[PDB]
């Protein structure tokens, strides 16, 4: 809807301009028409509450604008009035258009340096092609005009002014597309900070440094670190550099810089983890504490999955309580009742295995469920870097184990169902620990990108081929004796047999002792060419093409998963297992700060 | 044939020139021979009716040509006479050769600016390496000569002159290979238009704008739009531009610009759909109306295919009316007659499912058959972008359902045959709707390019291996008892078993309880190495290589299929479901035209 509305607003602005000789003269730069018309209403408006001076500024007409102020100087103070552009002044427009002389002329008339363009055209949104904040200084910074940024601070513009998101100009600058002035402009604006402006948080709680991390602005991140590094010594090709970890390690805060970076929705935030002080810090944390503890947690989880598997294998079963009648029934055994199920030393050993099994399902829920709420369910389940799909299946596993325990307590039949799903998802969730090892981590990401990519696309077109051919095979065999060829004997079996025949995992139905219907040979030749020969090998060809084009994305995602594991372990484990990282400054007279020392060759 | 004929014409032209001292002097530029020979027939002809002045112009000899006119000025007016070059003048030739002084000399003698070179050498065809139209002005435009184009219009050449295709010079220019003058030359020729010349249609009904769309000339399309855009405002990096949709949306016309573009045979016409106003218009139409309605039509078609499938599953069958005799017969059931087939509430429910099934087959034919005639059967079935092969199978489906209904009404046996083909093609045609979704559309094009590409090439060489080895296996087993190994028991079964063994979809024939002929082990080892190991994996290797080299073509074809779906839906659906797209100019005083407003960052 918003596009058609904005489109109408734009048409309606031009309609009023074209309808009004003052606004047309201001757009056209018709000095002669202004020199007639201004002598005989100056406060008349375009469709959004824009004045003739907004029009003159928009069409970049200094000559018209100086006439309009000479006739009616109060126009320099006027905001626009309607929701798209409300609060916008001719000063915001003169800054957008980089017209230094028109800006200085509006300031000479006393246009407000602190006016907020609060309308919907100025809010960070997918609707807007730019986000310059709401103040003339924020615009002057985002257009890169050093002259206008100085001229506005000379006229009393406040560098610490915040917009409707709480963004100061330093936050607005870090949100810009990477262009050469943006770091120059940040370094200029901090020269007027003489708490510091770069410590002011927005309404998300982000300081400009954390915003650079979340937004993936690696150029601004390196610029921010030039003032947090100290070059300790240089000797020949070697230098020792000491980096202040205060902002990076984010000590004692609920949401850390590293957590905000790994949990960011933006693709570019992974590149912050490859920036020098960050890369060495998370590397140290991983090789020192993270990998050792993750290998222990993997071992404990594998041992727990062996315990659960043993409790499935030794599950309590007795010879069935009724006779089998029809030859098609093969069930011979049956679930024991509670007071039959715990009557031997072997059951008492299985019972402690069941209690360990249930205890671990509770511990999974106690560890997982609080992090759904903190992170938000969309990010907690939806992020490859955090382990999103492994969170879905490990909670499903714990839910199915607790379902199995309430079924057991109730003497409820069919425990084999939740136990089978629990064994599959229980064991498949061991692949969460693949992320700890360079052999297996990148490959586990590649399997994930194949499942949510080429597998769903293949399975939709495969389902349509299966519905076609299974129906053809079923009705081809409906005339025939099902005991002579069973694969297509009823429609559910025909679907299942056709699915197995698509994958070639059962042999092509054959009985050379009998005359099969001629339409089967035809239909199977068409199915063998389309499903088996073409489609299944085209799935190989498709994944082969996807693999080489995904290979770098897979490796970046793996380096990000190691960091997200490191961050998660340190936040969740007891603090005595995670000593504070880097060098304590207090031992060396550097005050309360902590450092990373990096030595490098150049 | 035409090459050998033209070749003879060219040899015969040179033969006459070499035979005739006047024409040889005109080619050679032998001024001294002309200064002897011209004093004592000047109207004598080369093999195609060319004069000595045509020869002098062709060999680019101004000196000879001014002598020939000094002796016989009527030569400037002479056309060539024979079918290859009929109507060609020395003025057409002097323009081809860009000889401004020779052109101005022929015009001083009163050579016709409006002569038509109507012969076969000048017609748009695959025989001709250039198409410059038929008039000297059309040639002057296509050689890019601004001096000669001005000099010809100064001498009264008509810019609106049309050739045998109805092409004006603006159409001829849009047909040229993209070279720097072609837009300059179009912009020059419109400066003499002061209805407009760019509204004149050719004999296909195409104006120059629609011809640029059909021909895929994206450079001329962008040039044409520079005069249909209005830049509404510019502010900082943003601009709002208003594009006139009149030619693009082609409102109320039988064949629209967008339909002519998507239905074009030329590969380059897809690139027009990625040009700014077109791209935003078809995108709006798709996201606003096309995708919603296509998802409904997909749902209704899937529900219809479920209804038909249910009518196949519940088809009316009774226990056979005769005893089975030989053990090889497995048929136990049989088709019911009409007065047996509709006798229960379950049959009455199936009957309304059959009536819905038949009604939908009629509705498919009522929707499809008129579009065969309008589009032409070669384009309607032959285009990947329009859905050509899906039109073939969906009409085959409807034909087989109506065949099945006339069989049913006749009590005709073997309904299983058209029903099986109808189930396969009925369900496979659901993949037509894959084009609506980015997950499935590109992949459905890739399956199509594999079927008509690497699959036919593999299936021809596979058939030759199957004929070889099936014959070897059959005659190897002819000596042996068919009840001990059935796969090769007769030649049709040997072919079918060999085809299934090629694909590995049945197991290698084995019976370890008996002595198989030694020639079987040899022949199967050769078949396993050639068919299974080599050829079938070479099919995987081949499609893998085809896939990466086709991947971009596949994605362009998908973006074109979304537009062709959008265009088709809007033309076929009721108009109240497709409100006219863009902005009505009449609300804003812009007259009867409709616009797209585009906002962009630069
Ligand atoms: C599904 C299993 C149906 C079943 O349960 O099958 C049938 C139920 O209706 C069906 O076939 C369902 C037909 C529709 C299936 C196609 C739509 C699938 C969804 C597509 C999604 C896109 C149970 O009967 P039956 O197929 O065992 O035998 C045939 C029955 N006679 C012997 C008495 C004739
Ligand atoms: C075809 C099936 C033939 C059939 O119908 O097979 C035969 C008919 O002649 C054939 O074999 C056709 C032989 C030619 C096949 C090769 C050409 C195929 C086309 C190539 C295209 C390029 C029916 O007899 P039979 O093969 O069942 O047994 C053998 C008969 N004896 C036991 C009495 C000896
Ligand atoms: C029990 C059966 C009947 C069915 C219901 C179970 C589904 C299993 C096989 C499927 C469901 C989702 C799948 C799945 C989800 C996502 C990932 C993350 C990826 O990086 C590695 C593979 C992995 C871990 C796979 C493993 C197989 C799973 C767990
Ligand atoms: C990869 C995609 C295509 C997935 C969705 C495919 C699913 C189809 C082919 C498979 C998946 C589960 C299969 C399935 C589940 C269980 C049963 C019960 C069995 O006694 C009869 C067959 C029946 C009913 C089959 C029918 C075919 C199904 C539904
Ligand atoms: C019923 C059997 C015996 C035989 C005769 C039928 C043939 C089927 C299997 C074949 C014939 C042509 C094939 C075909 C034609 C072209 C296309 C377009 C492509 O983009 C997707 C696949 C698709 C839709 C395939 C699907 C499988 C089809 C429909
Ligand atoms: C992919 C290409 C090679 C295609 C054309 C291959 C076709 C051959 C191998 C297959 C397609 C259909 C098959 C086929 C159709 C139906 C029957 C009836 C059956 O009772 C005996 C075998 C017989 C006669 C087989 C013989 C082998 C055929 C003709």
Numbering used by the authors:
A (entry chain B), B (entry chain A): 28 to 67, 71 to 224, 230 to 637
The authors write:
Transient receptor potential vanilloid (TRPV) channels are a group of six polymodal cation channels subdivided into two subgroups by their sequence identity and functional properties. TRPV1–TRPV4 comprise the first subgroup of non-selective Ca2+ channels, TRPV5 and TRPV6 constitute the second subgroup of Ca2+ selective channels. TRPV channels are blocked by ruthenium red (RR), a universal pore blocker for a wide array of cation channels. Here we use cryo-electron microscopy to reveal the molecular details of RR block in TRPV2 and TRPV5, members of the two TRPV subfamilies.
Next, we prepared cryo-EM grids of wild-type rabbit TRPV5 reconstituted into nanodiscs treated first with 400 μM PI(4,5)P2 for 5–10 min and then 1 mM RR for 45 min before preparing grids. This dataset yielded a single stable state: TRPV5PIP2+RR with C4 symmetry at 2.65 Å resolution. TRPV5PIP2+RR contained strong extra density at the TRPV5 SF consistent with the size and shape of RR, but did not show the expected density for PI(4,5)P2. The RR molecule in TRPV5PIP2+RR remains coordinated at Site 2, with the Thr539 backbone carbonyl and sidechain hydroxyl forming hydrogen bonds (3.1–3.2 Å) with ammonia groups of the top ruthenium atom. The bottom of the RR molecule now occupies Site 3, which allows for the formation of hydrogen bonds with Asn572 (2.9 Å). TRPV5PIP2+RR also has density coordinated at Asp542 which is significantly separated from the RR density and is likely caused by the coordination of an ion at this position. Conversely, the addition of RR to PI(4,5)P2-activated TRPV5 caused the channel to close and take on a conformation identical to TRPV5Apo. No density in the TRPV5PIP2+RR map was observed for the PI(4,5)P2 molecule, likely because the channel is closed. Based on our data, we propose that RR interaction with Asn572 at Site 3 may pull the S6 helix towards the central axis of the pore and closes the lower gate at Ile575. This closure would draw the key Arg584 residue away from the PI(4,5)P2 binding site, leading to the observed loss of PI(4,5)P2 binding.
